[PDB]
Design an enzyme around this catalytic site. Structure first.
Site, PDB file in Angstrom:
ATOM      1  CG  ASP A  75      -2.056   1.044   1.024  1.00  0.00           C
ATOM      2  OD1 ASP A  75      -2.377   1.426  -0.134  1.00  0.00           O
ATOM      3  OD2 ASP A  75      -2.627   1.449   2.057  1.00  0.00           O
TER       4      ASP A  75
ATOM      5  N   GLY B 227      -2.341   7.898   3.456  1.00  0.00           N
ATOM      6  CA  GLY B 227      -1.315   8.375   2.547  1.00  0.00           C
ATOM      7  C   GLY B 227      -0.345   9.347   3.200  1.00  0.00           C
TER       8      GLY B 227
END
Ligand SMILES: CCCCCCCCNC(=O)[C@H](Cc1ccc(OCc2ccc3ccccc3n2)cc1)NC(=O)[C@H]1CC[C@H](CN)CC1
EC number: 3.4.21.7
Length: 246
Positions: free
Chosen positions: A101, A197
Protein backbone atom coordinates in the site's frame (compact mmCIF):
# COMPACT_ATOMS: atom_id res chain seq x y z
CA UNK A 1 19.01 28.71 0.71
CA UNK A 2 19.36 24.97 1.51
CA UNK A 3 17.01 23.33 4.04
CA UNK A 4 17.88 20.02 5.71
CA UNK A 5 15.27 17.29 5.40
CA UNK A 6 13.12 16.63 8.41
CA UNK A 7 13.91 19.90 10.22
CA UNK A 8 10.84 22.12 10.59
CA UNK A 9 11.47 25.85 10.72
CA UNK A 10 8.46 26.20 13.05
CA UNK A 11 9.09 23.71 15.89
CA UNK A 12 5.99 21.51 16.29
CA UNK A 13 3.86 21.53 19.43
CA UNK A 14 4.52 17.78 19.90
CA UNK A 15 1.22 17.62 21.85
CA UNK A 16 1.27 14.49 24.01
CA UNK A 17 -6.82 13.08 13.17
CA UNK A 18 -8.71 12.18 16.40
CA UNK A 19 -7.22 13.61 19.57
CA UNK A 20 -3.87 15.32 19.33
CA UNK A 21 -4.01 19.00 18.47
CA UNK A 22 -4.03 21.55 15.72
CA UNK A 23 -0.41 21.92 14.58
CA UNK A 24 1.44 25.17 14.58
CA UNK A 25 1.10 26.28 10.91
CA UNK A 26 3.98 25.02 8.76
CA UNK A 27 5.53 22.92 11.53
CA UNK A 28 5.13 19.76 9.36
CA UNK A 29 6.42 21.21 6.08
CA UNK A 30 6.53 17.89 4.22
CA UNK A 31 2.80 17.27 4.70
CA UNK A 32 0.93 17.45 1.44
CA UNK A 33 -2.71 17.23 0.48
CA UNK A 34 -3.56 15.02 -2.51
CA UNK A 35 -6.53 16.46 -4.38
CA UNK A 36 -8.81 15.96 -7.31
CA UNK A 37 -8.35 18.38 -10.33
CA UNK A 38 -11.29 20.32 -8.75
CA UNK A 39 -9.38 20.78 -5.46
CA UNK A 40 -11.05 18.13 -3.24
CA UNK A 41 -8.80 16.66 -0.51
CA UNK A 42 -8.86 12.86 -0.44
CA UNK A 43 -5.46 11.77 0.94
CA UNK A 44 -2.30 12.91 2.58
CA UNK A 45 1.21 12.46 1.24
CA UNK A 46 4.78 13.30 2.20
CA UNK A 47 7.22 15.36 0.18
CA UNK A 48 10.48 13.35 0.09
CA UNK A 49 12.38 15.38 -2.55
CA UNK A 50 11.40 18.51 -4.56
CA UNK A 51 9.87 16.33 -7.32
CA UNK A 52 8.62 13.32 -5.32
CA UNK A 53 5.72 12.62 -3.00
CA UNK A 54 5.21 9.36 -1.15
CA UNK A 55 1.61 8.26 -0.48
CA UNK A 56 -0.57 5.15 -0.07
CA UNK A 57 -1.25 3.13 -3.22
CA UNK A 58 -4.95 2.98 -2.31
CA UNK A 59 -5.10 6.77 -2.81
CA UNK A 60 -4.31 6.25 -6.49
CA UNK A 61 -5.93 2.98 -7.33
CA UNK A 62 -9.11 4.51 -8.98
CA UNK A 63 -7.25 6.48 -11.64
CA UNK A 64 -4.02 5.77 -13.44
CA UNK A 65 -4.35 9.25 -15.10
CA UNK A 66 -1.84 11.74 -13.60
CA UNK A 67 -4.25 14.58 -14.65
CA UNK A 68 -6.72 13.22 -12.03
CA UNK A 69 -4.45 14.54 -9.29
CA UNK A 70 -2.81 17.62 -7.91
CA UNK A 71 -0.63 18.13 -4.85
CA UNK A 72 -1.04 20.99 -2.36
CA UNK A 73 2.14 21.99 -0.51
CA UNK A 74 2.72 24.43 2.33
CA UNK A 75 -0.87 24.40 3.54
CA UNK A 76 -2.40 24.76 6.98
CA UNK A 77 -6.10 25.41 6.30
CA UNK A 78 -7.76 22.77 4.10
CA UNK A 79 -10.31 25.11 2.47
CA UNK A 80 -8.93 28.65 2.40
CA UNK A 81 -5.40 27.92 1.17
CA UNK A 82 -2.67 30.33 2.26
CA UNK A 83 -1.18 32.69 -0.37
CA UNK A 84 2.17 30.87 -0.55
CA UNK A 85 0.59 27.42 -1.13
CA UNK A 86 1.92 25.58 -4.15
CA UNK A 87 -0.49 23.54 -6.27
CA UNK A 88 1.40 21.16 -8.58
CA UNK A 89 -0.04 18.72 -11.10
CA UNK A 90 1.16 15.11 -10.94
CA UNK A 91 3.27 13.93 -13.92
CA UNK A 92 3.55 10.18 -13.29
CA UNK A 93 2.40 7.53 -10.80
CA UNK A 94 4.54 4.65 -9.58
CA UNK A 95 2.77 1.91 -7.63
CA UNK A 96 4.89 -0.41 -5.51
CA UNK A 97 5.30 -3.54 -7.69
CA UNK A 98 4.45 -6.22 -5.08
CA UNK A 99 1.09 -4.43 -4.56
CA UNK A 100 1.86 -3.16 -1.05
CA UNK A 101 0.00 0.00 0.00
CA UNK A 102 2.65 2.55 -1.00
CA UNK A 103 3.26 4.62 -4.11
CA UNK A 104 5.22 7.53 -5.51
CA UNK A 105 4.00 10.58 -7.37
CA UNK A 106 6.42 12.46 -9.55
CA UNK A 107 5.42 16.12 -9.70
CA UNK A 108 5.17 17.90 -13.06
CA UNK A 109 7.48 20.62 -11.66
CA UNK A 110 9.75 20.60 -8.60
CA UNK A 111 8.30 22.14 -5.48
CA UNK A 112 10.07 25.33 -4.42
CA UNK A 113 11.72 24.52 -1.07
CA UNK A 114 11.07 27.23 1.50
CA UNK A 115 10.72 27.54 5.25
CA UNK A 116 7.14 26.12 4.79
CA UNK A 117 7.78 23.39 2.16
CA UNK A 118 10.60 20.98 3.09
CA UNK A 119 11.03 17.25 2.49
CA UNK A 120 10.90 14.65 5.23
CA UNK A 121 13.99 12.40 5.63
CA UNK A 122 13.81 8.78 4.52
CA UNK A 123 14.88 6.07 6.95
CA UNK A 124 17.85 3.79 6.39
CA UNK A 125 16.95 0.60 4.49
CA UNK A 126 15.18 -1.98 6.64
CA UNK A 127 15.42 0.12 9.82
CA UNK A 128 13.13 -1.25 12.55
CA UNK A 129 11.36 1.31 14.76
CA UNK A 130 11.60 -0.13 18.26
CA UNK A 131 8.63 -0.77 20.49
CA UNK A 132 7.37 2.34 22.34
CA UNK A 133 9.21 4.87 20.14
CA UNK A 134 7.29 8.15 20.18
CA UNK A 135 6.18 9.23 16.70
CA UNK A 136 3.72 11.66 15.16
CA UNK A 137 1.04 11.46 12.54
CA UNK A 138 -0.39 14.47 10.75
CA UNK A 139 -3.26 15.23 8.43
CA UNK A 140 -6.59 16.83 7.60
CA UNK A 141 -8.68 13.69 8.22
CA UNK A 142 -11.72 13.52 10.45
CA UNK A 143 -11.58 14.41 14.19
CA UNK A 144 -14.41 12.47 15.96
CA UNK A 145 -15.29 15.39 18.33
CA UNK A 146 -11.75 16.36 19.26
CA UNK A 147 -11.60 19.81 17.62
CA UNK A 148 -9.65 21.14 14.69
CA UNK A 149 -11.62 20.09 11.60
CA UNK A 150 -10.33 21.97 8.58
CA UNK A 151 -6.83 22.61 10.03
CA UNK A 152 -3.73 20.49 9.91
CA UNK A 153 -3.58 18.33 13.04
CA UNK A 154 -0.94 16.19 14.68
CA UNK A 155 -1.08 13.33 17.17
CA UNK A 156 1.65 11.65 19.20
CA UNK A 157 1.47 7.90 18.87
CA UNK A 158 3.92 5.35 20.30
CA UNK A 159 4.94 2.50 18.00
CA UNK A 160 3.69 -0.94 19.09
CA UNK A 161 6.05 -3.65 17.92
CA UNK A 162 4.44 -6.05 15.43
CA UNK A 163 4.52 -9.09 17.72
CA UNK A 164 2.51 -7.12 20.29
CA UNK A 165 0.26 -5.50 17.73
CA UNK A 166 -0.66 -8.91 16.33
CA UNK A 167 -1.96 -10.22 19.67
CA UNK A 168 -5.62 -11.28 19.81
CA UNK A 169 -6.57 -8.21 21.94
CA UNK A 170 -5.22 -5.89 19.21
CA UNK A 171 -5.05 -6.79 15.51
CA UNK A 172 -5.04 -10.60 15.79
CA UNK A 173 -2.32 -11.51 13.31
CA UNK A 174 -3.24 -9.17 10.47
CA UNK A 175 -0.10 -7.00 10.46
CA UNK A 176 2.62 -7.86 7.95
CA UNK A 177 6.37 -7.38 8.36
CA UNK A 178 6.13 -4.57 5.77
CA UNK A 179 3.72 -2.73 8.10
CA UNK A 180 4.06 -1.19 11.55
CA UNK A 181 1.58 -0.25 14.29
CA UNK A 182 1.22 2.90 16.30
CA UNK A 183 -1.36 4.04 18.79
CA UNK A 184 -2.51 4.54 22.35
CA UNK A 185 -4.17 1.38 23.51
CA UNK A 186 -6.64 3.29 25.76
CA UNK A 187 -7.77 4.81 22.44
CA UNK A 188 -8.86 8.40 21.83
CA UNK A 189 -5.94 9.48 19.60
CA UNK A 190 -5.50 8.24 15.98
CA UNK A 191 -5.31 8.89 12.27
CA UNK A 192 -8.75 8.69 10.65
CA UNK A 193 -10.57 8.95 7.29
CA UNK A 194 -8.78 11.47 5.10
CA UNK A 195 -5.39 10.95 6.78
CA UNK A 196 -4.36 7.95 4.72
CA UNK A 197 -1.31 8.38 2.55
CA UNK A 198 0.13 10.90 5.03
CA UNK A 199 3.21 10.58 7.21
CA UNK A 200 4.13 8.85 10.39
CA UNK A 201 7.41 10.51 11.46
CA UNK A 202 9.69 9.73 14.39
CA UNK A 203 12.19 12.22 15.80
CA UNK A 204 15.77 11.00 15.94
CA UNK A 205 18.29 13.32 17.71
CA UNK A 206 17.70 16.50 15.58
CA UNK A 207 15.26 15.64 12.75
CA UNK A 208 12.12 13.79 11.80
CA UNK A 209 12.37 10.58 9.83
CA UNK A 210 9.49 9.23 7.78
CA UNK A 211 8.86 5.73 9.16
CA UNK A 212 5.29 5.08 8.13
CA UNK A 213 2.62 5.82 5.53
CA UNK A 214 -0.90 5.95 7.01
CA UNK A 215 -2.66 2.90 5.60
CA UNK A 216 -5.60 1.32 7.46
CA UNK A 217 -7.19 0.46 10.76
CA UNK A 218 -10.24 -1.09 12.40
CA UNK A 219 -12.02 2.23 12.83
CA UNK A 220 -10.30 5.23 14.46
CA UNK A 221 -9.14 5.76 18.01
CA UNK A 222 -10.88 2.69 19.40
CA UNK A 223 -9.34 1.16 22.53
CA UNK A 224 -7.00 -1.73 21.65
CA UNK A 225 -7.16 -0.95 17.95
CA UNK A 226 -3.99 0.86 16.88
CA UNK A 227 -3.53 2.08 13.33
CA UNK A 228 -1.48 0.34 10.69
CA UNK A 229 1.14 2.06 8.56
CA UNK A 230 3.28 0.89 5.70
CA UNK A 231 6.83 0.36 7.04
CA UNK A 232 8.70 2.85 4.90
CA UNK A 233 12.14 1.40 5.60
CA UNK A 234 11.25 -1.79 3.75
CA UNK A 235 10.67 0.31 0.59
CA UNK A 236 13.63 2.71 0.66
CA UNK A 237 15.62 0.73 -1.89
CA UNK A 238 12.58 0.64 -4.21
CA UNK A 239 11.84 4.37 -3.67
CA UNK A 240 15.47 5.36 -4.35
CA UNK A 241 15.44 3.19 -7.48
CA UNK A 242 12.32 4.87 -8.85
CA UNK A 243 13.75 8.35 -8.17
CA UNK A 244 17.10 7.34 -9.77
CA UNK A 245 15.33 5.87 -12.89
CA UNK A 246 12.93 8.75 -13.44
C1 LIG B 1 -16.91 9.26 -1.82
C2 LIG B 1 -15.54 8.92 -1.21
C3 LIG B 1 -14.52 9.96 -1.68
C4 LIG B 1 -13.22 9.81 -0.89
C5 LIG B 1 -13.05 10.99 0.08
C6 LIG B 1 -12.98 10.51 1.53
C7 LIG B 1 -11.53 10.09 1.86
C8 LIG B 1 -11.51 9.32 3.19
N1 LIG B 1 -10.35 8.40 3.19
C9 LIG B 1 -10.43 7.13 3.58
O1 LIG B 1 -11.47 6.59 4.00
C10 LIG B 1 -9.15 6.33 3.42
C11 LIG B 1 -9.29 5.35 2.26
C12 LIG B 1 -9.56 6.03 1.01
C13 LIG B 1 -10.74 5.79 0.27
C14 LIG B 1 -10.96 6.45 -0.95
C15 LIG B 1 -9.99 7.32 -1.46
O2 LIG B 1 -10.11 8.04 -2.63
C16 LIG B 1 -11.24 7.85 -3.54
C17 LIG B 1 -10.94 8.48 -4.78
C18 LIG B 1 -9.82 9.28 -4.96
C19 LIG B 1 -9.55 9.86 -6.20
C20 LIG B 1 -10.34 9.53 -7.31
C21 LIG B 1 -10.08 10.07 -8.58
C22 LIG B 1 -10.92 9.76 -9.66
C23 LIG B 1 -12.04 8.93 -9.45
C24 LIG B 1 -12.33 8.45 -8.17
C25 LIG B 1 -11.46 8.71 -7.10
N2 LIG B 1 -11.73 8.23 -5.86
C26 LIG B 1 -8.82 7.57 -0.73
C27 LIG B 1 -8.61 6.93 0.50
N3 LIG B 1 -8.77 5.65 4.67
C28 LIG B 1 -8.24 6.34 5.69
O3 LIG B 1 -8.10 7.56 5.68
C29 LIG B 1 -7.82 5.50 6.89
C30 LIG B 1 -6.61 6.12 7.64
C31 LIG B 1 -6.22 5.22 8.84
C32 LIG B 1 -7.42 5.07 9.80
C33 LIG B 1 -7.07 4.18 10.98
N4 LIG B 1 -6.02 4.73 11.84
C34 LIG B 1 -8.64 4.48 9.08
C35 LIG B 1 -9.02 5.35 7.87
Amino acid sequence: PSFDCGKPQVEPKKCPVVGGCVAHPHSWPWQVSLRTRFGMHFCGGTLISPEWVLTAAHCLEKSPRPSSYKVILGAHQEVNLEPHVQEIEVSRLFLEPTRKDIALLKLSSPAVITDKVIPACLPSPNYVVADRTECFITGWGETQGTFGAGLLKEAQLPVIENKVCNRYEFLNGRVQSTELCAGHLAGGTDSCQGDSGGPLVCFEKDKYILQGVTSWGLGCARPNKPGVYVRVSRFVTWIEGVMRNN
